[PDB]
Design a protein around this ligand. Structure first.
Ligand SMILES: CCCCCCCCOCCOCCOCCOCCO
Ligand SMILES: CCCCCCCCOCCOCCOCCOCCO
Ligand SMILES: CCCCCCCCOCCOCCOCCOCCO
Ligand SMILES: CCCCCCCCOCCOCCOCCOCCO
Ligand SMILES: CCCCCCCCOCCOCCOCCOCCO
Ligand SMILES: CCCCCCCCOCCOCCOCCOCCO
Ligand SMILES: CCCCCCCCOCCOCCOCCOCCO
Ligand SMILES: CCCCCCCCOCCOCCOCCOCCO
Ligand SMILES: CCCCCCCCCCCC[N+](C)(C)[O-]
Ligand SMILES: CCCCCCCCCCCC[N+](C)(C)[O-]
Ligand SMILES: CCCCCCCCCCCC[N+](C)(C)[O-]
Ligand SMILES: CCCCCCCCCCCC[N+](C)(C)[O-]
Ligand SMILES: CCCCCCCCCCCC[N+](C)(C)[O-]
Ligand SMILES: [Ca+2]
Length: 427
């Protein structure tokens, strides 16, 4: 939740990402737990993508009387994944992957009446991971990984109906009868709803590490603990606002006006650390259950704040997230040599306290329902197909001069192809 993504594989999608630190039926899980490397005795490849089709809607009425209805404010997304794992020795192995652990997109029409808190909010990240692992004995394995994260981000906000609202208050006040107030009201009326009042964009790399432990009770039952470090992205990018500079320094609740001029802006984005415990139990030749609890330190994300080369605040939005958990439970039906089926459910606690909710990050507690299948063409190759349905609760949002309600759900569809090489690294 809150911009965190779980879509590292399509088999995982069909499980509702349950017990992902503890299952190693394909190469995708190494990205989640590097210790799982020790479960692979030949070079193994997996690649695919998950298509996310959100349906997130906003409703309400502005004090101007304009509707705050906004349908489908969360664009579709295509999240790819690629994974490779290989033994080095009977005791060591390595793996690498390309995945995305964080990403968000919320995009309103630029004439939206609530544009000052709407507009566009986009974050895309690509996690490049290189991992290694060591098997201590039949029971214990340990893994460590290095992550290089590339992030591209953009925020835009627009005037919306603020100009109309301000003109209305001026004209209803004693100032409405003065030359000064009338001049200000004309200026306020002149601010078109699609006037850009903030633009931030930048691209940057950050770095992190991750680690895992695997405990195998036997070949059919294992448990895992993993940690993914925080990743700090220190963007240096562009900031501008098309409002006249004369708007500045009155304490108005709008971003810094720059008369359309671009200047360098700095913003630090913290991608939060995450812990996860997982279990996998193959209770029968044809059946396994798998389950997990994850804890994400979303308290590490406190605000979006862009500052200038003089250290002044250009744009600032308080977020105040809280640490949050995700719990998931799934089962896998190993039907025959070709067919495997799976299903799962999960609950994702929103890291956003009610008072801190915003329409640009329209988040809510989410429930997952998942189903999937894998067809193995032979001992070396297979395809995974997965589908998930996510449903969140409708919530009230109070932001700036506006009151909104938000509702959200999503469909997710994923396909992966898997290939294992006829190749061993024994000594
Ligand atoms: C004119 C385009 C940019 C807007 C200039 C600054 C706008 C900041 O003011 C906040 C707008 O809020 C509207 C004020 O509503 C009238 C006051 O009474 C309503 C409070 O309940
Ligand atoms: O009290 C707030 C007064 O702020 C006035 C904003 O100034 C208007 C700026 O627009 C003038 C464009 O040249
Ligand atoms: C926080 C919005 C800025 C507009 C408030 C301006 C302050 C007006 O009050 C002046 C009262 O002095 C008499
Ligand atoms: C002025 C330019 C400052 C540098 C560019 C910054 C670009 O915008 C960053 C927008 O990032 C949006 C993040 O979305 C919030 C969800 O992710 C939070 C996880 O920590
Ligand atoms: C307009 C909303 C988009 C509707 C997508 C629904 C797709 C449901 O089909 C899933 C079938 O898989 C069965 C599990
Ligand atoms: C992409 C390759 C496979 C396509 C999967 C898409 C979903 C279609 O499969 C639905 C489930 O079909 C069940 C198969 O029935 C079991 C096979 O029966 C043979 C046993 O003798
Ligand atoms: C409840 C919604 C919050 C909106 C208003 C809350 C109280 C703020 O009103 C302060 C009044 O200050 C008046 C200044 O208005 C801006 C005029 O400048 C725009 C001229 O272009
Ligand atoms: C290609 C590298 C980056 C991966 C693409 C991600 C682009 C940003 O979009 C993130 C996808 O998430 C969209 C919303 O997620 C579903 C939550 O909304 C549904 C409400 O239940
Ligand atoms: C569908 C298969 C394509 C998967 C793409 C792998 C990752 C590409 C990186 C962008
Ligand atoms: C616990 C770390 C295990 C050592 C990993 C050795 C392989 C690393 C390859 C890069
Ligand atoms: C809501 C009106 C705000 C702009 C008017 C400025 C003039 C204030 C004069 C007070 C005497
Ligand atoms: C804030 C915790 C510091 C990281 C320690 C994690 C140890 C790796 C466990 C798997
Ligand atoms: C925040 C101080 C409020 C004082 C009101 C002065 C408004 C003057 C606006 C400039 C146009 C003359
Ligand atoms: Ca080799």
């Amino acid at each position: 939740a809150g911009g965190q993504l779980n879509e590292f594989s399509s088999s995982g999608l069909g499980r509702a990402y349950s017990g992902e630190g503890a299952i190693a039926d394909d190469a995708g899980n190494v990205s989640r737990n590097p210790a799982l490397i020790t479960m692979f005795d030949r070079p193994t490849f997996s690649a695919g993508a998950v298509y996310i089709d959100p349906d997130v809607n906003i409703s309400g009425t502005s004090p101007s009387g304009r509707s705050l209805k906004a349908d489908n404010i969360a664009p579709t997304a295509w999240v790819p994944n690629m994974h490779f794992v290989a033994p080095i020795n009977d005791q060591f192995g390595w793996g690498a992957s390309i995945t995305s652990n964080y990403g968000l997109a919320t995009e309103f029409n630029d004439t939206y009446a609530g544009g000052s808190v709407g507009g566009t909010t986009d974050l895309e990240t690509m996690n490049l991971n290189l991992s290694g692992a060591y098997r201590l004995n039949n029971a214990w394995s340990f893994g460590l990984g290095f992550n290089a994260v590339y992030a591209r981000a953009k925020i835009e906000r627009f005037a919306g109906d603020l100009g109309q609202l301000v003109a209305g208050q001026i004209m209803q006040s004693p100032a409405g009868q003065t030359q000064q107030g009338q001049a200000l009201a004309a200026t306020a009326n002149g601010i078109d709803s699609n006037t850009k009042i903030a633009h931030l964009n930048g691209n940057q790399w950050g770095f992190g590490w991750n680690a895992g432990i695997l405990y195998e009770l036997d070949k059919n039952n294992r448990y895992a603990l993993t940690y993914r470090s925080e990743v700090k992205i220190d963007f240096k990018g562009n900031y501008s606002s098309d409002l006249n500079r004369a708007f500045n320094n009155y304490g108005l609740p709008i971003p810094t006006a720059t008369g359309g001029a671009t200047q360098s802006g700095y913003l630090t984005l913290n991608l939060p650390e995450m812990w996860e415990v997982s279990g996998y139990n193959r209770v029968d030749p044809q059946w396994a259950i798998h389950y997990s609890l994850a804890y994400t330190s979303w308290s590490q994300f406190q605000q979006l704040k862009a500052t200038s080369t003089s250290g002044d605040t250009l744009f600032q939005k308080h977020e105040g997230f809280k640490d949050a958990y995700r719990i998931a439970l799934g089962t896998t039906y190993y039907y025959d040599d070709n067919w495997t089926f799976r299903t799962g459910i999960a609950f994702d606690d929103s890291p956003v306290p009610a008072q801190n909710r915003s329409i640009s990050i329209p988040d809510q507690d989410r429930f997952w329902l998942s189903a999937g299948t894998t067809y193995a063409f032979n001992k070396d190759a297979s395809v995974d197909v997965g589908v998930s349905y996510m449903h969140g609760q409708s919530v009230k949002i109070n932001e700036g001069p506006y009151q909104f309600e938000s509702e959200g759900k999503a469909w997710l569809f994923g396909t992966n192809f898997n290939y294992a090489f006829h190749h061993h690294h024994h000594h």
